[PDB]
Structures are given as C-alpha cells and as structure tokens.
A paper describes a structure:
An alternative way to improve HDR editing rates is through downregulation or inhibition of key factors involved in competing NHEJ and MMEJ pathways, such as 53BP1 and DNAPKcs (NHEJ) or DNA polymerase theta (MMEJ). In this study, we leverage this functional screening system to assess focused libraries targeting the protein-protein interface of i53, an engineered ubiquitin derivative, and its binding target, 53BP1. Using targeted saturation mutagenesis at the i53:53BP1 binding interface and a screening process in primary human HSPCs (a cell type with intact DNA repair, DNA damage sensing responses and other cell stress sensing signaling pathways), we identified i53 variants that introduce stabilizing interactions with 53BP1 and are more potent than i53 at increasing HDR editing outcomes in HSPCs. Using these classifications, we determined that the addition of i53 variants results in an increase of HDR by specifically reducing NHEJ events but not MMEJ nor other types of outcomes, consistent to their role as 53BP1 antagonists.
We first screened individual and combinatorial saturation mutagenesis libraries targeting two adjacent i53 residues L67 and H68, located at the binding interface of i53 and 53BP1, and identified amino acid variants that were enriched in the GFP+ population relative to i53, in particular variants that introduce a positive charge at residue 67. Of the 19 new variants tested, one (L67R) was found to be significantly enriched relative to parent i53 (L67), although L67H was borderline significant and was also moved on to subsequent validation. To understand the molecular basis of the improved activity and binding of the de novo i53 variants identified in our screens, we solved crystal structures of each variant bound to 53BP1 (S2.2, S2.3, S2.4, S2.5 and S2.6). We observed that the L67R change enables a new 2.8 Å H-bond with D1550 of 53BP1, and that L67H forms a network of inter- and intramolecular H-bonds, including a water mediated H-bond to S1554 of 53BP1 and an H-bond to D64 on i53. The intermolecular H-bond to D64 could help lock the i53 loop conformation observed in the crystal structure and lower the entropic penalty for binding. All recombinant variants complexed with the 53BP1 Tudor domain and exhibited increased binding affinity relative to parental i53, suggesting a correlation between the improved affinity of the selected variants and their enrichment in the GFP+ population in our screening platform. Taking this data altogether, we chose four i53 protein variants that represent the sequence diversity observed among top performing hits (L67H, L67R, T12V.T14H.L67H, T12Y.T14E.L67R) to further characterize as protein-based HDR enhancers in HSPCs. Incorporating the i53 variants resulted in a significant increase in the proportion of HDR-corrected alleles relative to WT i53 at two different protein concentrations.
Numbering used by the authors:
A (entry chain A): 1485 to 1603
B (entry chain B): -3 to 74
Write the structure that this text describes.
Amino acid sequence: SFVGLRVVAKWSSNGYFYSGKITRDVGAGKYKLLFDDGYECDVLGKDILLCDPIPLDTEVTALSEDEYFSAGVVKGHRKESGELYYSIEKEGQRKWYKRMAVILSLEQGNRLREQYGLG
Amino acid sequence: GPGSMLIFVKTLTGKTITLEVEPSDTIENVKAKIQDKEGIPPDQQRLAFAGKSLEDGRTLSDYNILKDSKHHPLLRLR
C-alpha cells in the first residue's frame, strides 16, 4: 500500500512539491495527502514522488533563516527527536533544515519522477 | 507581467501558495491576488515578512524584500 508512506507532492500543474504523507488511496487516480505543515487535500498520483528521504545530491529549494527560499543541494540527513533534518548546501555553505523547509520546484521534482514517481 | 517575481505565502491553514508579483504591486494588490487564488478576503489578511508587518500602500520593494530571481520571499498571513 502507499497508505502511510512519506512523499513529496504537488497539488497544481506547475506547482512546488511539499513533503507529506499519503493517508488514503481514493477514487479517480488520486490520493489524500496530509502535508507536514497541516494542509490536507487530494492530489493526483502523477504529482507524487515516493522518495523519503530526498536522496543525496538532489537539487531542492529550501527556506533559509532569512525567510527566502532558494536552490540548494542535499548533502546529508539526520533523524533526531522523531524529526528529519536535511543538510543542504547553498553557495558553498551547508545548513540544517527541517524536512518541511525543503520543497521542490516543478523542474526539481520532475528530475526525480523517473526514479521515484508513484505508479 | 514579464518582470514579475515569485513569492510564497503561508496561510493560516498551513498551506503555502505561490504568487507572481510586480515590484510595483502594493500590499493591497498582493492581498487581492491571495483572494483571487485562495479565496481569503482581504479583510482577513494581515501579511508579514520576517516578522514585520507589511503596510497598505507600500510595495515589497519599499521593504527591500525583492532580490534577484534566485531568492523567493516567504510572506506569512497572521
């Protein structure tokens, strides 16, 4: 079952992918998704990436302390207090980001579809 | 239009949406875009960036928020 799996998923044709979990396989090619920041909605299967964690050297978009999203590369991960943190490099410098602060642009997520797309 | 810039907005429900904005867009225009996309009436919207309130009649540029096209600010509804 995909139910209970962690994923990264988008809910619009050109949108960003956000981390969450599948809570149900529902009708019409869709899955109910609970996103980590609390938003719940149905999403199309084509818009789900079953990668958890996002692998090393993936290009991602991450929210810095200064409240800007920008691109970086995954360099590591850590599990602590039941939470996952990613080490992401931007402009040669690594910082640690909560899972929910790491998202994928349309282009970045499309790069992972062949290996991690659902179905 | 062609010189528009991507921003993110986190709503009270925990959903983050994207918007394209102009440097000349006022905060009221941003609130209208949020209404148009997400259905939240402007009268419910209070926007902040990095913990500072964004006033009516200002643009994001009047707060030095917009950078290059490589860095996208997250605004937060409060």
